[PDB]
Design a protein around this nucleic acid. Structure first.
Ligand SMILES: Cc1cnc(N)c2[nH]cnc12
Length: 231
DNA sequence: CCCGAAGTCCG
DNA sequence: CGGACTTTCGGG
């Protein structure tokens, strides 16, 4: 069974505009975990738009198939394009897609893909179906996979006043001893971001609970101005 | 335009 | 460690 014609077309069109000179520093930026064609986002989005204009967006029955096929291609631009395409099918994504999204998180994993899946797609799903959080978050925290652990931390990133504070701090407490940069930094990020909504609670949390130095520093990057730095 | 959100380099 | 500074992306 051949690849979907939409994916074959995208592959051909992206490859025709590859830039090996840019691809080298792009690959180094991602610590050489991926091959790159060398196409940056504004052009990549236009090339995708070209293929949609010519071929039309594939029927929804093929949505997951298209995403997986792009996920399996070597160059990182194809996963970036897959995420652009998933945004176009956004109105069709629901709680039944959580395992599909899990699998994307733990394949071809790095911060660029995981941070584009978690606070947006998963965040939206768990906002609508909070009763399902406990069907996934404990497993993710207990996982060997740091990207699932990061997912547990960041799915609430954009919740603002809908933040479940008790949940947030419980998750952070479970992971606060991790020596993994991407976990320490995610804790810092979600605290920094939530501090834009409720700075008092974040300040109290970081002053009174154990965190990695990186996590605490990133959490209070802005709000330390509001409280001051004691002698 | 602006600002806020990985990377290298250097005490 | 944490500050100084980098490019790229998203959004106001
Ligand atoms: C994630 C992130 C944070 N700060 C910056 N200055 C960045 N530049 C590119 N990505 C960045």
């Amino acid at each position: 069974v051949p690849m979907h014609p939409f994916v074959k077309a995208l592959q051909e069109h992206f490859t025709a505009h590859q830039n090996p000179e840019k691809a080298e520093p792009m690959a180094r930026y991602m610590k050489n975990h991926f091959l790159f064609l060398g196409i940056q986002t504004p052009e990549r989005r236009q090339l995708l738009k070209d293929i949609i204009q010519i071929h039309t967006l594939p029927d929804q029955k093929d949505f997951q198939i298209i995403i997986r096929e792009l996920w399996d291609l070597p160059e990182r631009e194809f996963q970036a394009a897959a995420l652009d395409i998933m945004q176009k099918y956004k109105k069709h994504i629901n709680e039944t897609h959580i395992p599909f999204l899990e699998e994307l998180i733990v394949t071809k994993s790095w911060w660029d893909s995981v941070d584009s899946i978690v606070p947006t797609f998963l965040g939206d799903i768990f906002l609508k179906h909070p009763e399902l959080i406990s069907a996934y978050i404990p497993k993710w925290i207990a996982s060997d996979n740091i990207w699932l652990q990061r997912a547990a931390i960041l799915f609430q990133l954009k919740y603002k006043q809908k933040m479940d504070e008790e949940l947030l701090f419980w998750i952070i407490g479970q992971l606060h001893s991790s020596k993994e940069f991407f976990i320490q930094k995610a804790i810092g990020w979600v605290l920094r971001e939530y501090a834009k909504t409720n700075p008092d609670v974040v300040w109290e949390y970081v002053q009174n609970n154990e965190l990695a130095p990186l996590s605490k520093r990133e959490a209070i990057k802005h709000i330390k101005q509001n409280y001051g730095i004691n002698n």
